[PDB]
């Protein structure tokens, strides 16, 4: 729910300020979205040990985690060593109308995605959609009526 | 003749091939909405299933994802082609198909829609291409730098001979509904800011409460306003907060509201604010010539604004045809030392 | 939520609608128009594309039996195929190049036994080359294959 | 490297038996050197910046960049970066019956960045035409703003701002290091080498970077070099290569 | 000499050339060994008497 | 703690850059041993206790 | 104080679904139990640098 | 939970060394289901419910 500048000035910049002393680092670059998301990319000199770089980055990231907001923490922060191009996109549909889109997509996230994303040689898995959550959709009139807040 | 043609021949890296696949990108203007970008995604998917149905097999369309970064105004479409065999001809390869489609989408009503090919080794670049970071080298802030950036574009347009399609990679600023909580009025009325900010944020933002188990899998639990009360500026006053009085105060009894511009994608380069700019050298003229010019335009930007090359345009000071020089000399040494001579080499080397 | 002091109850359902729904609702995907989801997969730095893609479709095959009736996998965008056919159309061109060597030692020698000292010689140093590319740790790729062809 | 790993793999054992107080801050695992490779010192030439202003400038616009520059280990800032420094007077705090407890609460309350969602957010009501971020409270940005932080409203309607109980200003985060270049106020980066790297090619990177930043300096700031170790190297190579051509003539 | 140099065109592109060259030079190192075992001995004991 | 030692409260943005916010006693009031008697803490009954 | 299901559902699952993009892993396994403890153990390929 | 399973509360220093500090219930008061009735808990009232 955070807006771009809120992300920048509470996640992005604190993380950036702790990317110190990380061998063969050519440049660093980062986006902070209206969508509440930040991704920072550290790009390393060629033939750098990609496993070591990650360790090295994640090290410094760890020293900064305590300073991120609980909410950014609780959503899970990640450091991946990926290729930026999609290797492929595996699709999933429903033949017989027994699953909605929301349902198909939940099934994927919760039966497929984890297995795939542990299969060695797979840097990142993007889910085109969402895992289910329990949704409480507050009514403000009904809430006020009973003299209640969220 | 050999020395003539040589100097009159272009110098690419690896040919862009037809890989069975390609991608289309959709960016709608900011303000846009999910349902409006789905219109555009349909017209994209349509073009490929009706007009280019001899060549296409699958379009997998994603509203909300983008090559750019996430958001409710962007989309992408992955496109699969029939086998190479089943589509013979050069007007049935990616090169053509992407061109036709891009041209075709060119008249999509207000949305950048661009079909393009996978480029051999993505990280290594588009031949005539450059990638440019403008930078808040000290203090300025988003607005002063948006302007610096504008200056730069405006003036690179004034050299179509050397530069083409110089453009920002980022996003233009868009309106934003600012809300002030007046601290006095709140602290007067008996409402903490803690309850104020939680109520606003949870309702309109959504809020991860705790986990629960759905069919034996731990999953998040979220609280948020039903969509109806979260759509319009007015809906702000639907929301009430309980003071220590016991009494439900309107939001509108401790709060102003006003429209303000701001960025939806703040980008940063090596640790400080930036704005990425892409473009190519003009047809004929080379990239080092466009880069030279872009640095020069860059030179005349306002105080506190710098630049940096990055990506494909980052440092190529390596390779060299000085190792062509050694080659024929070490070829020489070894023809010489074969023929026990120093004129018998010039026989073959020529 | 509360017990109204008159005796009444305020259950959560009386102030909010409650359903399973996405963690998120930003992302929505169709497949030739039909509602869908899928996994966009990016490859890990240095991983092999072809191995990783097989690994995935192994693991996906592990899952198909246990899908819930109606669900179907679909393959809308794959990098690997071309990498695999690119190499094979070369390895075809390399055998064709032997077959056109063999037949221009017959407008040029005419002993079947002698048109064979060449046509054997080529294959024996190729297959040795592969062993050396193996020694130095190289892969079989579009540059090493065009190596052999030249 | 493979020894930072192993050290970090063994520090995991100790990790939770250390107090949560410690586990905030954090534990570094740096491949360390000891001596300084060099010390870059910054001074001001024309009275437009103090020792504390220079320090904050160096930290906020040079140290970050250099600590990522090609080759460098730890960087040491000789001075500190600014912070918002609320200096509270215990008497004025009594006058209104207040405590540092009330001051910190207020500060957390009114200097805060708050996520407030958006209009036209997903999932929407179908037909929605606009979507824009809802911005609320932001972080404060100035001493005036921190001054105006309400602490309490008195009985008579009159208000106790934060400037009523405290002196507000930019200051350092610590006031412990204080550096001087030939008697003159300075700050400086004390650069360390990164566990085997081309100290010669490192210092020319540090120096090449410093030049990238030089044109954006404020009027009066001047980099100076009170302590490079690399000229000794550069020369010592000449004076053995001097021998080379001496000996091959003799 | 005509090849091994390009196996050191290093940086960025380098490994594209490094792959090509080392392939072609390894293939020549094996060519002589073929011309110094199989091409001679076989000529002796394959192509007809004349 | 906040008085004699300082306390990092939260952050702010100084000229486009997140930096720290500190509360601490002014110098006058944390220099002598006697100065401990300057601070009052407030009991829950609304009155200030030295 | 925890029991296998408490331990599994608050600790084991959360970790497991969170072990990703680890290289050369063959399989992994968990024993969330009623002493109030869990162990998860990932097994790698032969040759993996441990 | 504290009574019947035990809480980890915090640390202390025994003989120059850092060590945990649990509070459980005295074993006798957490053996069998009738033991539950032994325990009580403060309300708003400020009485002791069981």
Numbering used by the authors:
A (entry chain A): 51 to 200
B (entry chain A): 551 to 900
C (entry chain A): 251 to 400
D (entry chain C): 101 to 350
E (entry chain A): 451 to 500
F (entry chain C), H (entry chain B): 751 to 800
G (entry chain B): 51 to 100
What text does the study give?
In general, the structure is almost identical to wild-type AcrB (RMSD 0.70, 0.67 and 0.78Å for access, binding and extrusion monomers, respectively). Surprisingly, the structure shows that the entrance of CH1 to the proximal binding pocket is still completely open in the access and binding monomers, similar to wild-type AcrB. The shortened loop flexibly retains the same length between Cβ5 and TM8 as in wild-type during the export cycle by unwinding a part of the α-helix. Now, the random coil region is 864YQERSGAP871 in the access and binding monomers of the truncated mutant. Although the channel is completely open in the binding monomer, in the extrusion monomer, we found that the loop was tightened and stretched compared to wild-type AcrB. In contrast to wild-type AcrB, the loop was not an α-helix extending the top of TM8, but a stretched coil from the top of TM8 to the bottom of PC2. The rest of the protein domains were unchanged compared to wild-type AcrB, indicating that the truncated loop was still able to act as a gate for CH1, facilitating efflux for certain compounds by opening the channel completely, although the truncation of the loop did cause a significant tightening of the loop. It also shows that this significantly moving region of AcrB is very flexible and that the deletion of three residues (about one turn of the α-helix) does not limit the ability of movement of the porter-region sub-domains, nor the energy transduction from the TM-domain to the porter-domain.
This secondary efflux pump facilitates efflux by using the electrochemical proton gradient and besides being the main cause of MDR when overexpressed, its physiological function in bacterial cells is to export naturally occurring toxic compounds, such as bile salts. The physiologically active form of AcrB is a homotrimer consisting of three protomers, each representing one step in the drug-extrusion cycle. This functionally rotating mechanism is shown by each of the three monomers in the asymmetrical crystal structure of AcrB: access, binding and extrusion.
